[PDB]
Structures are given as C-alpha cells and as structure tokens.
Amino acid sequence: SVVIVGKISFCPKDVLGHGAEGTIVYRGMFDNRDVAVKRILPECFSFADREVQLLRESDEHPNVIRYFCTEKDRQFQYIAIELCAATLQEYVEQKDFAHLGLEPITLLQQTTSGLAHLHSLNIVHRDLKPHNILISMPNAHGKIKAMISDFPGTEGWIAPEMLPTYTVDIFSAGCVFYYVISEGSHPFGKSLQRQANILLGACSLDCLHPEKHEDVIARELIEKMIAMDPQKRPSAKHVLKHPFFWSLEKQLQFFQDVSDRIEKESLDGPIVKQLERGGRAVVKMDWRENITVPLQTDSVRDLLRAMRNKKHHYRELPAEVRETLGSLPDDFVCYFTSRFPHLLAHTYRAMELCSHERLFQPYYFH
Ligand code: NA
C-alpha cells in the first residue's frame, strides 16, 4: 500500500517525524525527486497556504528549505519539501552525527544567513528553534548545510516581549547559538523552566568559560542576542560580522589593521582613549611576565605593536622564538589567545568608533 496524490507519492510506513498540531512528515517523492511529504489536517489548511507562499518568496536561498509543490485531496493538503538528514535537535542530542565532521560555527553562520534572507524579504520566522532548523542531505561534493524550515511560537525559545519585529528571531537564534556551542544547554535552563525564566530574565551562560578566548568571543555575541531589551539585540547582518565567525587568519589581520590605524594617534585622541579604557586587566597587569620564556628575551596599544612587529619581521627572526610563536597565521594568533582571552573582545568593542571606515568595513556593519 502506497499513497499517490499526483504529482506527490509517499509511503505510509516511512515517517520522518511528527508535528505538535497533528501534521505528519513522510518520506515520499515528487516528479521523480526524493522529497519529504508534509501531511496537514483541515484545521491547518489556512496555515499551510501562507507557509508555502512565504517559501515561494524565500526558498531560493541555500539556507531556506526548497519547496516543491502542494497537492490537496478531499481529506488533506500535502506539502512536497526538500528531504533532509536530521533536525538540529537530533544533530546536537545524538553525537553519531559527530562523524559527519560538521563545524558548529559554520552551521550557525548558515542558520543566520537564511534568517538574514527572510528579514531582507520582510519575513519574521517567529518560531526559530533546533526542531525547525534542518541538516541537509550530503550533496555531490559531500557538503552538508543548515537550513531553515516551518514558519505564535513554541515554549522556551520565545522572546520575552512576545508574551512582530525581526529582533524576536535574534533572541531565538541567541538561544540556538548557545544550544549548539554548549552542546545541549539553553541560556534559560531546562525545557519546562525556560519560558518562566525568560519572563523573569534569569539566564546563565556558565558553559562558556570566562578566561577562554573562544568562550569569551561567543559570550560577547550571545549576551547581546538574548538581551531583554529588543533594541539592544543586533540584526542578522550585524551577527554575521561578529568575530565569532572570523577565521584565525582574519582575527590576526584585525589586530594588524587596528595597530596600523593607531601610530600616529595621540593618547588624548578619541580612538586611543576608548582602546586603553579598562585594560589594564585585559593585558593581565603586565604582558611581559605571562609571555613564553624565549619571547621575553627578544598598555594594549603597545601589545598590539609587539604582535604587528613580530608578524612583519617573522622570517627575519630567530628559529627558537618562531618555534614557540608560529606557524603563522593560525598558530601565531593562537599564541596570544588565550594568553589574553579578552584581547579581541575588548579591541572589537573599543574600535567600534571606526566601523564606517573602508579599512574596517570587513569587521563591522554600518
Ligand atoms: Na533553498
């Protein structure tokens, strides 16, 4: 027995998942393509119409599921959609997807690109969560991607103000970011306490270490994303510019570009004053003492100067000190972080004053 509602045809035995409203997703086919067949009830026929329309407008993005067709019979409405590997919940909870060798930062960059696309088309998802974010089937080059599907919300992932602006999605994304990164934790705790904690603004990002550079940069972003004030949350395009998505090569380039921007620059100047403020503690009182034994033999403003000079004169430097420092650029920048885990976070926050400048266009959003 196999249901055929032309051009759609699904096998009733093959079930991919279930929906909270009674909807059931089957493994089926459309125009000789392997698709996912979403079966919806008559109570949700109205919902289905606006869902497939929003998709008609946005499915061209590679991070928004591809929508194929909708066929209606006397009993149900069927949505032929792109076939995927798992949900982001199934990916994070079951670490047998570990062997897929996917990068969490790449999945979150992919999720935020899809979100940015919806927001650019003047679409607010309103229900972003790991169940709704999908893992694609490996393409011909074996690459897997994160995609957005299923468009008032679902408990624990709803912005406090929602109890219909784009910033509601940034809140939800902020929780998804921590969920992926921590590997299953949520800023507002366990599943059943989340919405009460959101209303109360009671959050914890304690999986993120305060003296670990990767955890520091992730926290700078996530805290602004899950902000109780919507107006304080960055746009999707601002999130995509954050150092959380930068490569080790890019991070080092920023440290060079900022040290190039200072000198000549007077201390009373509006740029040098904002950079020096509160670090001190960023440099760990004295940066000369915490450095490795051979480098010390060879102010943030002068620490950045040291890093720029040793980078520039790297191949005309002794083999003993380039051994403890390099190889450049990856291992060289990883030397200084987490030697100073607040170095990049502080410099990025401080150098915001130059966002508009052409040299700082790949680092900020205007
Ligand atoms: Na797509």
Considering 31, 96, 127, 330, which one is annotated as catalytic?
A: 127
Question: Strand pairing partners for 133?
Answer: 148
CA 103 to chain CA centroid, Å, is 11
Q: Are residues 272 and 318 in the same domain?
A: yes
CA 353 to chain CA mean position, Å = 24
**144: its two tokens:** 């897997």
> Last residue of a domain, which of 192, 220, 247?
247
Contacts of 61 (CB under 8 A, 6+ apart): 113, 114, 117
Domain finish residue from 47, 62, 82: 82
Same domain, 89 and 220: yes
CATH number at residue 129: 1.10.510.10
Collect all residues with Cβ–Cβ distance below 8 Å to 258 and sequence separation of at least 6.
275, 304, 347, 351
343 neighbors 300 (Cβ within 8 angstroms): yes
Same domain, 3 and 101: no
Spacing, Cα 195 to ligand 1 middle (Å): 31
The domain boundary, picked from 247, 276, 301, lies at 247
Note the resolution in Å, 1 decimal.
2.6
* The residue type at 244: F
Q: Strands 8-18, 77-82: parallel, antiparallel or unpaired by DSSP? A: unpaired
Let me know whether 54 and 101 are in one domain: no
Phi, psi of 103 (to 5 degrees): -100, 125
The alpha carbon of 78 and the centre of ligand 1 are apart by a number of angstroms equal to 19
30 with 47, same domain? yes
Please report how many Cα atoms fall inside a 13 Å half-sphere around the Cα of residue 209, on the Cβ side.
Answer: 6
223 lies in the same domain as 106: yes
Neighbours of 237 (CB within 10 A): 15
**Would you say 265 and 272 are in contact if contact means Cβ atoms under 8 Å apart?**
yes
- Cβ-contact 118, 148 below 8 angstroms: yes
Domain encompassing residue 2: 1-82
3-state secondary structure the chain: CCEEECCEEEEEEEEEEECCCCCEEEEEEECCEEEEEEEECHHHHHHHHHHHHHHHHHCCCCCECCEEEEEECCCCEEEEEECEEEEHHHHHHCCCCHHHCCCHHHHHHHHHHHHHHHHHCCCCCCCCCCCCEEEECCCCCCCCCEEECCCCCCCCCCCHHHCCCCHHHHHHHHHHHHHHHHCCCCCCCCCCCHHHHHHHCCCCCCCCCCCCHHHHHHHHHHHHHCCCCHHHCCCHHHHCCCHHHCCHHHHHHHHHHHHHHCCCCCCCCHHHHHHHCCCCHHHCCCCCCCCCCCHHHCCHHHHHHHHHHHHHCCCCCCHHHHHHHCCCCHHHHHHHCCCCCCHHHHHHHHHHHHCCCHHHCCCCCC
**184 annotated as a binding-site residue:** no
Say how many Å lie between the CA of residue 124 and the centre of ligand 1: 17
Distance 250 CA to ligand 1 centre (A): 28
Is 215 one of the catalytic residues? no
Q: What is the CATH number of the domain that holds 36?
A: 3.30.200.20
Instruction: Mention every residue, 6+ apart, whose C-beta is less than 8 A from residue 214.
Output: 338
Strand partners, 4: 9
Q: Are 112 and 146 part of one and the same domain?
A: yes
Residue 267 sits in the same domain as residue 169: no
What residues contact residue 263 under an 8 Å CB cut-off, 6+ apart? 305
User: Are 71 and 23 found together in one domain?
Assistant: yes
Strand order in the sheet with 133-136: 84-87, 133-136, 146-148
The verdict on 92 and 51 lying in the same domain is: no
Same domain, 279 and 289: yes
Number of domains in the chain: 3
Give bridge partners of residue 9 from the DSSP assignment.
4, 29
Q: How was this structure determined?
A: X-ray
Alpha carbons within 13 A on the beta-carbon side of 296 = 8
Say whether 19 counts as a known binding-site residue: yes
Residues 354, 275 within the same domain: yes
